């Protein structure tokens, strides 16, 4: 079976999402996020030399194929530059990838 699984859900912080502008007017609204979950085959093995460990570590990532602009409904007036909208990478399938393991604030 597919080593992952895809499903749109609502993150609690994004349930509903709040975003503020200058002069303190806020736009809120639920924002569904793409969720990839599953069981990726992983392994750790000892090797020669340095580093002595090798990690075939993989997590359920999504296959980004587009970008989604959700907007926020319940908007306070004067919503300016940054808000009324937000950009979310979007796809339709999940794969086992180690990219979510490299960007630890690098």
């Amino acid at each position: 079976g597919k080593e992952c699984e895809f499903a749109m859900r609502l993150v609690p912080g994004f349930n509903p999402l709040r975003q503020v502008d200058a002069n303190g007017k806020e736009c809120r609204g639920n924002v569904e996020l793409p969720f990839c979950k599953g069981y990726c085959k992983t392994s750790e093995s000892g090797t020669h030399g340095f580093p002595p460990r090798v990690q075939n570590s993989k997590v359920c990532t999504l296959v980004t194929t587009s970008t989604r602009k959700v907007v926020l409904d319940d908007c306070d007036d004067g919503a300016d530059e940054s808000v009324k909208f937000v950009m979310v990478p979007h796809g339709t399938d999940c794969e086992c990838s180690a990219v979510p393991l490299e960007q630890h604030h690098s």
Partner: protein, 88 residues
């Protein structure tokens, strides 16, 4: 659910000049649970992941009988395999 098994591995060292010598090691292999979502508020990925890793191991030394100088090789071998944080 999860699963992370210890597996025996026979590895053959075939270095030109040095004697052919086999080594029996153990490695971890399995399927652990993980889920990831692109967090645009932080503009990165939010990960909550398990990976089948070695919690404890044991270094294995061996001499490699080479014609131009014997060598000393060091390899870790698994003792307990388990699904643990991928980042630690």
């Amino acid at each position: 659910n999860n699963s992370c098994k210890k597996v025996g591995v026979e590895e053959l060292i075939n270095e030109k000049g040095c004697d052919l010598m086999i080594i029996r090691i153990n490695r971890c292999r399995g399927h652990c649970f993980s889920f990831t979502f692109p967090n645009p508020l932080t503009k990165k990925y939010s990960v909550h992941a398990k990976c089948c890793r070695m919690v404890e191991w044991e270094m294995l030394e061996t001499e490699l009988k080479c014609s131009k100088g014997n060598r000393n090789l060091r390899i870790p071998s698994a003792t307990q395999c388990e699904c643990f944080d991928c980042l630690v």
